[PDB]
Ligand binder design. Structure first.
Ligand SMILES: O=c1[nH]cnc2c1ncn2[C@@H]1O[C@H](COP(=O)(O)O)[C@@H](O)[C@H]1O
Ligand SMILES: O=c1[nH]cnc2c1ncn2[C@@H]1O[C@H](COP(=O)(O)O)[C@@H](O)[C@H]1O
Ligand SMILES: O=c1[nH]cnc2c1ncn2[C@@H]1O[C@H](COP(=O)(O)O)[C@@H](O)[C@H]1O
Ligand SMILES: O=c1[nH]cnc2c1ncn2[C@@H]1O[C@H](COP(=O)(O)O)[C@@H](O)[C@H]1O
Lengths: 442, 442, 442, 442
């Protein structure tokens, strides 16, 4: 009575899937050394990473310090949502203002503010000077209070007019760039360069640190104005939009609309809704494990699709619900769909060693997301303690993020050398795998 | 000389089968939240469960206390056969009379009975009042002896005429329902409501507990008269019928005709025989692992087929006899046959975690049976002891049945959310699996 | 230039094979209870076993005591070749004469022999009487010296004429059978019945033990004259024939021409040679693992083919030489060839539990051979000691052979019940397997 | 727009590969005993081995003592490159001059040299005599200083003219062979036989040791002039040629141009370049794991191809880069290509037991290379120490190379017996494998 009414019944057991340990990458003809290989990857025009790594949006993984360390390495951190909306937008603000933060949109105080406000702004952003203007209306620059002024201030409750030295200031015009500022800073022997207009109105501030961080971290992943990229997690809930609004106002570069099952009508509706209010916002949506789910999220408006159901190290999804797809099959199936739209995928979960990362990228993902490999690095949230004669996060202490990133990227370049891939696109398009038994694993 | 005489020889090694750890369920488009999902399942018109769980017919698993706890949770207990016929029918009687038990067919005493008979009836059924009638012939209600009367009785050997307070009784008519009784009980401030006819003849009794248990356990699996469902195990033996007769007279809702190999002529004959004497009796017959065995038991008259040979945790069948079928293949093969007849299957054995249960239902079973997951819960038979600083059953103590059921059902709803299944029928019909290697398990 | 010159190169990796843990037997419709099932199997007209078990021809497994215990259970022992030719033929002689041994071909002494010769013959055969005749020429019976005569003899160096009581003897005629003898023994109240002809010439002896052992072991595997069956191992070497000659003269029922690689021209030549000198001798030849090797040994004249290369528990063949075939594939491939000739196969090696035995028979073997499962039973060679608070063979002590056989056969009957097999032929012809993953094993 | 533009994408997961534990060799008809089997193998006309074993070019495996022990056993050692060019050529020189070293191109001293130079030459080569000539121009033999002369010399700083006994010397002509020399040495009762021309000019030296070593090691792998074969590792680097030049001048028999990824344009260019400068030099090039890489190295001019990426015991290649091919598939795929050119392959890495070696040769390699199986033998580099009550290399001490070689070759002959292979060519061409599950491994 119905065409192939028994089709769904008969296909129950047909699909097979492969995980990382089921395969190896086959060496191919290579003209390129691992060090000359390119690890850059573009998630979109406004998200351009210099290494294909994202730190997960978990409370044991990414807050502002992690997001800053990641972007400095060329990757992207995703600030977790296990805090209030204001706290999350503030975390975003700290990443965006870490460097090149106040060049076009400076903070400032009047002489009538207390030295407390200076300590607050310098503590909050880790910027060592606060411009001072005559009043909040004209905003004419009368001076600056710096970390060096604070050396001599005992009580902080006093007016800034009291403590402010009236000294000859060096200013530069609006539009002064970093490399120009570096010369002006070198010339007059100063660490701070307020930018003003023709009327003496403060438009901006450049610091020696804005210049030093460019040198210290040449691989930083930055926006068009030179500020570190940052993402932020958002749940699918009634208040998602309120949360997104505050993040966008804090100048977040991407939101991750994250849920256990991305293939639900609620998630699709939420992406449609966020896409409509914000045509240009980078929307990473997940989590999905099928070609059909990938197509639905893309057509709802997601521009990055996040892949993985069940592979996560601490996910009970497989044991409790019986649900999952082996991660390489999931990445490959989703990338097969997403390729047709020009849409990149993130491989989220189940990565143990750098080799797994190489495999995930070779199976078609543009980028991998790591929680557990990053949870013990120094910049992750949570305190250090010594307990077993061992330093711990309160999980084994891994040291600075940079050491872990360096090993991951080293592994990736090696893998790329073997596969003859000069860049990640060639790797996704061309790399071949060979399947092996469990005996082939040992 | 014979058509395909070598066919049986050549097919020896052809079949493959899959067990729980060989597969995962694939997420599908979902419009439905895990909490709004329906876990109800119908085994037949007279057996309707509110969660798809049955407690096994083993002496370490199910006696009256377990059967009562299970049915209260919405499932079904199967009283084991490792006791005498009278003991088993009595166990059945206790479950059926746990609540709403005496509404149409009350127990009663005369004034000439001893208070011992009252203690016995109240102990046996956990019902706190015993109606008293003038004589066994007219059965005219003269009073009631309750748990509160017993507070003041020291010696129990005395006549009930001595101890019975002559007090104004409140009675209601035959056909009074629970929700009516609740109002009458509230109004006159009483805990017991004998039901009588126009001549004062006792027809029944309702208690506040009959009303309270409906509220306390809104998911109870009950018969048409509001009594807890119960099953009972029967062996295939010469005295099976004698045993079945007593169980049916005790108002059992199903019998499980249980044997190691259900595919034997003796079992088929026994089902034919029981079906013939009792056209309406629910007959669960097992155990089978093939489509052919399923068809034979169905045509013999079984209305539920029990599936599993060798997967049971304590079965030596695989090691000793070399025999078995991987449980998901068994469930699927049997359900493929049983679907054609509109007959449900029970997946019996080999379930470790809730995920396995989700998989068994997704492979086509209507219901799973669990022995070992239930053997340590409080309501299972056997005493508590402390031994290793650990509470034990004399096996690790799992606490109340309700805690274990809550985790199982939580896992099931999650799995159903992932698969987009609003109800168990959709799950059986539509859920897809993906096969994975042993590396995909880790 | 050559037809398919690359065929051998391209087929290198094509074959797959299965071992015991790769499969389970599928239950089939059964009309037959495990206890009414027949476990008999015929290796040839002159070798008919009552259980399908053979004890291996290893020095830690089978000497006369083991061979006797095995045949009593219905199986066959194979006396190992790690002794001299005379020692091996003597071991064979002890098995054949264990019961019904001296009925047609008696030992005897004259009065001039010492009591030492009586002790020797009674010790050697465990027969408690020695017939005495007047001289080696007439062989006329003058009396008998028994275990009871020995009670009173202190010095054994004396002439038998001295110690022999002249007492009225009861004799029976030649051709007297056991059941007749039992009545004559009961009637005259005696334990020994010499058989003589019309002239008083000793032809034979029957003892109460010949009669008692028939009752004690109703399943004994016996030859046409009522003596226990026994086999013996022979190597392929220059002196094989000399060894075979002595075994045949000792009335061995089978020889096992045993070598690591049975598929060699030397083995085939040796079978051809032994077949030619002894047209009726049972020749078990091995070891082979392929259909082609099975055909070659059969056409060389072997009437039983022994199967297994590498599965043996203590074989290093797989690790050292890299060689082997998974045992069930080997059994099946060899049985496929051997079936065409009406030739039975023995599955030798790799059996751990009774389930494996059921599987080997279901894959087509008529009989399984066990070394390591038997090496600790009481009747195996080697002394008992207590060492770790544990009794040991000098390997864990398993107790009497009968206990191990009873568990094996119990497992076999169960398996046969499940498969609906009334006899081993039906099992070989009809049993089906299902393949499972390593996850299906756990 | 492009023919099969999606082909590379769709083939990603198609290949399967097998490692040693995935398979066993199938026994085949055999006419040949393991001891009469030939284990010889030809890598080229100028490299002819008597056992198919090469010791790896690692600093924990092969220096001069190892290379000498290996060639004496019939195999080939590869001197590692983790030393300077001069040190490596010197190591090569010691192997080539170990025996038959000075027959055509002798070292010599004048009377004006110190006894220090004699000690040096005798220490360096382990040759117990140094010819002495009148001057470096005529090179007329005036005498010889031997190990026996040194017994009486206390101070070594003295002129050789002082210490040299003027004694009647026995000389033989140029072209005198070893077997001739043996007779002359026996006849005149001497241990040293200088070879001279008609004018008394030293052309050469034969020692009793040159003769004794032929007897002691009848299986030595030697060049055309009777000197032990030796190989040497070279990296692909700017100074490779400078290194190769010195090795060729030291009369190396092969170079191994060794790199992690042999399939790179740099390696191919380097082979082309070395092939062009040295048309006759044996070039072993690696490492490759594919048919395409094998063809490229062969056409670049390599005459031996080395196979294996990732199987090496201490390689992190699989875990770190995610790259590799299961070793038997790699050997088979490469041998399939190399067969077409008449080119042999070396199976490098992943060999644990002798069985694995048999499998690698049966999959098509002419020879296996072993690092880790040899790293603890006595002749490997590094000191002995006792630490845990255990002798160690500073890794468990394996004793003399000869003991390990004897077990490997024993395993190989056994495997060859089973496969019916009289020689390694037949094994490569004809041996068949059977695939097994992980359950078939246990
Ligand atoms: O609490 C959980 N519920 C659902 N998914 C989780 C949870 N924790 C982690 N994950 C997922 O697993 C990933 C972590 O991958 P990891 O590198 O294997 O630990 C996260 O980015 C999430 O996608
Ligand atoms: O004694 C046994 N003999 C045969 N089957 C058994 C026995 N014990 C348990 N079983 C089976 O195994 C099931 C228990 O499944 P479990 O949840 O894995 O322990 C029971 O419901 C029976 O079907
Ligand atoms: O020493 C050995 N060399 C070759 N085959 C052996 C040896 N020991 C035992 N076997 C074989 O392995 C069988 C024993 O099987 P088991 O029951 O697994 O121990 C014997 O009957 C022989 O076929
Ligand atoms: O340091 C390493 N880097 C790359 N390859 C290596 C290294 N060490 C050993 N190998 C390879 O692994 C082989 C050793 O094989 P083994 O017998 O498994 O230890 C060597 O001959 C090399 O081909």
């Amino acid at each position: 009575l119905y065409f192939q009414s028994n089709a769904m019944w008969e296909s129950k057991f047909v699909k097979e899937g492969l995980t990382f340990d089921d395969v190896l990458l086959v060496p191919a003809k290579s003209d390129v050394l691992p060090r000359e290989v390119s690890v850059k990857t573009v998630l979109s025009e406004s998200l351009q990473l210099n290494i294909p790594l994202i730190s997960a949006g978990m409370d044991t993984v990414t807050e502002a310090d992690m997001a800053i360390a990641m972007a400095r390495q060329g990757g992207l951190g995703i600030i977790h949502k296990n805090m209030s909306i204001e706290q999350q937008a503030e975390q975003v603000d700290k990443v965006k203002r870490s460097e090149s933060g106040v060049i076009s949109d400076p903070f400032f105080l009047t002489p009538e503010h207390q030295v407390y406000d200076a300590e607050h702004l310098m503590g909050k952003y880790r910027i060592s000077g606060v411009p001072v203007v005559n009043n909040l209306d004209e905003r004419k620059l009368v001076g600056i209070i710096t970390n060096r002024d604070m050396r001599f201030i005992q009580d902080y409750s006093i007016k800034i007019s009291d403590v402010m030295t009236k000294e000859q200031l060096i200013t530069a015009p609006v539009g002064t760039t970093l490399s120009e500022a570096e010369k002006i800073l070198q010339k007059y022997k100063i660490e701070k360069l307020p930018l003003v207009d023709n009327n003496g109105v403060l438009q901006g501030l450049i610091t020696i640190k804005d210049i030093e961080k460019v040198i210290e971290f040449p691989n930083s992943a930055k926006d068009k104005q030179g500020r570190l990229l940052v993402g932020a997690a958002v749940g699918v809930t009634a208040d998602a939009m309120t949360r997104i609004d505050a993040l966008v106002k804090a100048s977040v570069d991407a939101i991750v609309l994250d849920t256990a099952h991305g293939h639900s009508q609620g998630v699709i509706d939420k992406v449609k809704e966020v896409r409509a209010k914000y045509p240009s916002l980078n929307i990473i949506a997940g989590n999905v494990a099928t070609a059909e789910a990938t197509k639905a999220l893309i057509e709802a408006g997601a521009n990055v699709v996040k892949v993985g159901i069940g592979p996560g190290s601490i996910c009970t999804t497989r044991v409790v619900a019986g649900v999952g797809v082996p991660q390489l099959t999931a990445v490959y199936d989703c990338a097969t769909e997403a390729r047709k739209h020009g849409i990149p995928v993130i491989a989220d979960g189940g990565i143990k060693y750098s080799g797994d990362m190489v495999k995930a990228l070779a199976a078609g993902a543009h980028v991998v997301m790591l929680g557990s490999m990053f949870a013990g690095v120094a910049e992750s949230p949570g305190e250090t303690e010594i307990y077993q004669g061992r330093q711990f996060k309160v999980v084994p202490y891994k040291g600075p993020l940079a050491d872990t990133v360096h090993q991951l990227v080293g592994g990736l370049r090696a893998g790329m050398g073997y596969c003859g891939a000069q860049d990640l696109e060639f790797l996704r398009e061309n790399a071949q795998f060979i399947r092996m038994s469990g005996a082939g694993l040992l």
